[PDB]
Write a protein that binds this ligand. Structure first.
Ligand SMILES: [Mg+2]
Ligand SMILES: [Mg+2]
Ligand SMILES: [Mg+2]
Ligand SMILES: [Mg+2]
Ligand SMILES: [Mg+2]
Ligand SMILES: [Mg+2]
Ligand SMILES: [Mg+2]
Ligand SMILES: [Mg+2]
Ligand SMILES: [Mg+2]
Ligand SMILES: [Mg+2]
Ligand SMILES: [Mg+2]
Ligand SMILES: [Mg+2]
Ligand SMILES: [Mg+2]
Ligand SMILES: [Mg+2]
Ligand SMILES: [Mg+2]
Ligand SMILES: [Mg+2]
Ligand SMILES: [Mg+2]
Ligand SMILES: [Mg+2]
Ligand SMILES: [Mg+2]
Ligand SMILES: [Mg+2]
Ligand SMILES: [Zn+2]
Lengths: 210, 40, 95, 98, 133, 85
RNA sequence: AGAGGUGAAAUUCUUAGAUUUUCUGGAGACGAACAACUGCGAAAGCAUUUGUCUAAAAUACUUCCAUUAAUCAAGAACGAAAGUUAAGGGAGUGAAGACGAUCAGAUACCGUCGUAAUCUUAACCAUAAACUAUGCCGACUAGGUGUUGGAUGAAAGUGCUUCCUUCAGUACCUUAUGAGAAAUCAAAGUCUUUGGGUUCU
RNA sequence: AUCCGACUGUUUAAUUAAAACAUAGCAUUGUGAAAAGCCACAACUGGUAUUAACACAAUGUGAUUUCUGCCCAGUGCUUUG
């Protein structure tokens, strides 16, 4: 029955809005602390509502809350996705698509997967219907993707990796470094899965929220 | 034996016995949840 | 008899082709013989579409589309008129 | 492949060159300073190979652990018995040393 | 709740249309803490028309009334079509539900298709030779 | 000359026990009475002495193995897993 | 407070909380979209990533040998699905079987359950519209449009693409003082102007 | 040629040696342990056990071949609160 109280949700300072909604929960009862019901929830937000621009209307962001001050949750970063219709609009008949995945560890001892995707291009002076590639070229391209992901992700940090995800720099680097094998159209990071977190440390988490 | 006797060599009583039966009486299938051929 | 040069499908230089399943009746059909239709449709029609526009935040909204990629068997396809029966000379007219 | 290269080089030694296989032969050759190269099989017993490699270190000769067995090494030569160690005292037209 | 002036309260509506019935389920934006569920088959008695547009319209109106009474004013939409090994297109009630919700008085946030498609394909019902009519 | 068409080893059991049981016995006892490679000395002279002990006739090393063969696939797989790591 | 399912319904599950949403673990099979009148293999067949073995073309060649070849009774290797034996595994589908409907009847088509089987390892069986319903090797005879893999020669380049020529696969279109009973065929043509070699029926 | 039991084996010392019992093969049931399964003891304590699911304990059928259909209403056993 509705005897429930509302709380506020807040995002870390990488983004721009910092207050993206409210949630409900039932009042506390004997050995029902009402905060063991809130922590660990997962929230999925579009990221065009997180940064207030319609260009990034794909790229949903997963946020998970860990620490609760009196009426607020603080809801740090958890994952990524790509809004299916965008994926479906990128697949046409006459081309070939490349795909790869890898495992990586940051300097904070987080573990992730990254799941890239790519397609081929036209080189307009060709006047031929199809743009297929040979298997050996596909193998070379995939190896390049794996190596570039590993370097870029294991190099720096979790927060800097997240800041790197927003403008899609990894795709630019992969596309530039593979031009000599075969021209490639739009290259994206399709999905990030967080695989293991080191340990909850409240000072760091509240540092994310100034 | 509880199965002894008769003119035709049959048991004559259900052969699945309960967990609580005394020592001289627990002699068939002991507290069986199921009987017959297994099918999985 | 022998009413088609290709035998009703497009297979050459191969022994076996794996089958798929009809979207309407569940039947098994080899992949090179089913008729493939790829449809890009809208969530709602044009009248209910402009009701969603004026009840929407963001002041400039584009409804998403749907992608289906249906496949059919011969019987379940020509009963629904995706494909018709033609005359002898017209049977050879492709694209 | 290194195994194929060493197998090819051994046949040249067998056709042109001077060698003898067996443990007593190898110790006799290293003792007198006549050895150019020893080759021991991976299967060779533990206390045999230590003596082989100590004589070689004193006598300044190379060792080259073979990649095969008692049977593989004897089949590398044209022989129908197992070897487990041999010594080349005269490399022939081959370049097995370099 | 206690909203400030000029800022809205959002929920998530999960629409489910499956050629046999039509669900309308509204939670908060975490998935937990469900709020309303009318399911369409609670508005007729015929055991058919459960997937008709009229039943979906009535369900949507009931959802909107309860939502307004609770304090929610905006809605995100996630659309589903029962698509496991079964059919991949939504049923006849989805459009009626969407239009009734849009004309109800709520504000519509975002629209998404979330039908559970497999890359995997366990075997499908009614083995080869299909369903014969 | 060839003294037997089918039964081979199991001709000592005469006509008893049924034909399929004798077939399984033959399959097992072909493995049980064979000679195996001794990886320590290189000769093929390893023979079973008891239900789980194998001894080489030349170098006299004793190895613990299977019941009817010197090795079993389940142990081969585990050992290969560990060595790969 | 209903859910499933159907032309309409029943059987079935459900306040002891079904159906529905969200998260965390385990299990077995499968490998969508890309994907084509495209690739490989003697046929049966072969589609997630990486490594290690292992063969096979095709092209290039002023390399070596010098007739070592073609087809093959007997004989040998492999051989979809189902089926048999043993040990595992066992989600989904589901010969048998049991129910609920329609029907004059319905041991069926529709629906709810569901056993063997389907998957793995070690052995059997030797069959399919196992079909291009067209045996294998060699010679000759016509134009065009493509496409998969090499090589040669020339131009727009941020040693890469476009074009030309040529070899090897592979389709399609037009037309045959060529052929057929015709359908049709680039071989199913070069057959009363009848004989290049050879196995099977 | 027919019946029974597959075979070697065992039995009513002193009226019954068999088609009876045993047997390999097949199937079912219980149990992850010193607070467990089955069994002994008045109590203290013991057997299996110098054991550990390819193990110990409790039943039925009775080599190989080919098979093992329908019924959970009754009586038993067993699962949830
Ligand atoms: Mg009694
Ligand atoms: Mg009896
Ligand atoms: Mg075939
Ligand atoms: Mg019909
Ligand atoms: Mg290809
Ligand atoms: Mg089995
Ligand atoms: Mg099952
Ligand atoms: Mg079923
Ligand atoms: Mg199996
Ligand atoms: Mg035949
Ligand atoms: Mg034929
Ligand atoms: Mg003639
Ligand atoms: Mg007897
Ligand atoms: Mg006797
Ligand atoms: Mg007597
Ligand atoms: Mg007597
Ligand atoms: Mg008896
Ligand atoms: Mg017995
Ligand atoms: Mg019998
Ligand atoms: Mg009963
Ligand atoms: Zn030995």
């Amino acid at each position: 029955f509705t005897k429930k109280e509302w709380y506020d949700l807040k995002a870390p300072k990488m983004f721009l809005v910092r207050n993206f909604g409210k949630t409900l929960v039932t009042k506390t009862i004997g050995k029902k602390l009402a905060t063991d019901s809130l922590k660990g929830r997962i929230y999925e937000v579009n990221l065009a509502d997180l940064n207030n621009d319609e260009d990034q209307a794909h790229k949903k962001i997963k946020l998970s809350c860990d620490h609760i001050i009196n009426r607020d949750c603080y809801t740090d970063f958890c994952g990524l996705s790509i809004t299916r219709d965008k994926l479906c609009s990128l697949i046409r008949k006459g081309y070939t698509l490349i795909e790869g995945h890898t495992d990586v560890k940051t300097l904070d001892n987080y573990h992730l997967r990254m799941f890239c995707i790519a397609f081929t291009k036209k080189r307009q002076n060709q006047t031929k219907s199809t743009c297929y590639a040979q298997t050996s070229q596909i193998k070379k391209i995939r190896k390049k993707m794996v190596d570039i992901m590993t370097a870029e992700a294991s190099k720096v940090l979790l927060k800097d990796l997240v800041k790197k995800f927003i403008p899609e720099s990894i795709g630019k680097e992969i596309e530039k470094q593979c031009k000599k094998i075969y021209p490639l159209q739009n290259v994206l990071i399709r999905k990030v899965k967080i695989l293991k977190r080191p340990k909850l440390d409240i000072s760091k988490l509240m540092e994310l929220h100034t | 034996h509880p199965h002894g006797g008769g003119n035709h060599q049959h048991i004559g009583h259900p052969s699945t016995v309960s967990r609580s039966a005394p020592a001289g009486q627990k002699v068939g299938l002991i507290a069986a949840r199921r009987t017959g051929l297994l099918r999985g | 008899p022998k009413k088609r040069r290709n035998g009703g499908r497009s297979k050459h230089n191969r022994g076996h082709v794996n089958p798929l399943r009809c979207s309407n009746c569940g039947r098994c059909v080899p992949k090179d013989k089913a008729i493939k239709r790829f449809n890009i449709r809208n969530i709602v029609d044009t009248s209910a579409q402009r009701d969603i526009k004026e009840a929407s935040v963001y002041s400039t909204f584009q409804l998403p589309k749907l992608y289906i990629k249906q496949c059919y068997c011969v019987s379940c396809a020509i009963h629904s008129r995706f494909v018709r029966v033609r005359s002898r000379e017209q049977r050879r007219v492709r694209k | 492949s290194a195994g194929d290269n060493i197998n090819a080089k051994l046949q040249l030694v067998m056709k042109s060159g001077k060698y003898q296989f067996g443990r007593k032969s190898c110790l006799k050759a290293l003792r007198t300073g006549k050895g150019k190269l020893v080759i021991v099989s991976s299967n060779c017993p533990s206390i045999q190979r230590s003596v082989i490699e100590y004589y070689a270190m004193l006598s300044k000769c190379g060792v080259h652990d073979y990649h095969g067995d008692n049977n593989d090494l004897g089949t590398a030569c044209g022989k129908l018995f197992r070897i487990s160690c041999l010594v080349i005292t005269d490399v022939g037209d081959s370049d097995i040393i370099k | 709740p206690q909203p400030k002036e000029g800022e809205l309260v959002f929920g998530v509506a999960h629409i489910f249309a499956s050629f046999n019935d039509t669900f309308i389920h509204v939670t908060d934006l975490s998935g937990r803490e469900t709020l309303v569920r009318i399911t369409g088959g609670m508005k007729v008695k015929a055991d058919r028309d459960e997937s008709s547009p009229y039943a979906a319209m009535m369900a949507a109106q009931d959802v909107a009334a309860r939502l307004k009474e609770l304090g929610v004013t905006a809605i995100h939409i996630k659309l589903r079509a029962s698509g496991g090994t079964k059919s991949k297109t939504p049923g006849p009630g989805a459009q009626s539900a969407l239009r009734a919700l849009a004309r109800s008085g709520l504000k519509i946030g975002r629209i998404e298709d979330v039908t559970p498609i497999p890359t995997d394909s366990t075997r499908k019902k009614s083995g080869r030779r299909g369903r014969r009519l | 000359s060839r003294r037997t068409k089918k039964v081979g080893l199991t001709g000592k059991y005469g006509t008893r026990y049924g034909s399929s049981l004798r077939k399984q016995i033959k399959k097992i006892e072909l493995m049980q009475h064979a000679k195996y490679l001794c990886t320590f000395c290189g000769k093929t002279a390893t023979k079973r002495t008891c239900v789980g002990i194998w001894k080489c006739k030349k170098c006299k090393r004793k190895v613990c193995g299977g019941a009817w063969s010197l090795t079993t696939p389940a142990a081969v797989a585990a050992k290969s897993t560990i060595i790969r790591l």
